[PDB]
Each structure stands twice: as structure tokens, then as C-alpha cells.
Amino acid sequence: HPPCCLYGKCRRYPGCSSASCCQR
């Protein structure tokens, strides 16, 4: 995947349900 927190914020690339901007 690219950066999952792009612009700080939580975009839906494959397996970024465990990015940290996604936790909120």
C-alpha cells in the first residue's frame, strides 16, 4: 500500500483497518 494516513487521515487501502489514524 501507499501511505495509509495521507493528509493525516484514514483511507481504505488493503489492510489499513490497523492503521492508527483509523483507530480515532
UniProtKB/Swiss-Prot annotation:
Family: Belongs to the conotoxin M superfamily.
Positions of modified residues (Glycine amide): 24
Expression tissues: Expressed by the venom duct.
Modified residues (4-hydroxyproline): 2-3, 14
Disulfide bonding pattern of the chain: 4-16, 5-21, 10-22
Localization, UniProt: Secreted
Cited function: Psi-conotoxins act on postsynaptic membranes, and act as non-competitive antagonist of nicotinic acetylcholine receptors (nAChR). Is more toxic than Psi-conotoxin PIIIF. In vivo, has paralytic activity when injected intraperitoneally into goldfish.
Descriptive protein name: Psi-conotoxin PIIIE
Comment on protein domains: The cysteine framework is III (CC-C-C-CC).
Domain of life assignment: Eukaryota
Parent-protein start and end of this portion: 51 to 74 of 75
